[PDB]
Homo-oligomer: A and B are copies of this chain.
Amino acid sequence: LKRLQSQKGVQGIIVVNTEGIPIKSTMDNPTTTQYASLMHSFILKARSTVRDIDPQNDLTFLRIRSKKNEIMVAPDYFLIVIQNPT
């Protein structure tokens, strides 16, 4: 989506399916590949960790902040948003 891509700070948006394959991206192919597979295994770990801590709970949102950027993830497929640090 254009509106979300256009927000201050946002660098790109990737939608990946349940197997981690990008089904939509606003980014170039190499960068989409830089992120999709690596983010997929990390997202599976976030989801399984929430459930190992409380079987009746569910992951709804993730924010990973680093020195250079920030990544948000929302389950729905997974929506991945890459952006400047907030």
Contact = CB atoms under 8 A, between A and B. Distances in A.
A46 B42 contact: yes
A63 B66 contact: no
A60 interface: yes
Most buried by B among A41, A65, A69: A65
Contacts of A50: 64, 66
A62 B60 contact: no
Interface of A: 34-35, 38-39, 41-42, 45-46, 49-50, 52-54, 56-69
Given A63-B62, A63-B63, A57 B68 contact: yes
Q: In the A-B complex, list the 5 residue pairs whose CB atoms are closest, starting with the nearest.
A: A61-B65, A42-B49, A63-B63, A57-B68, A45-B45
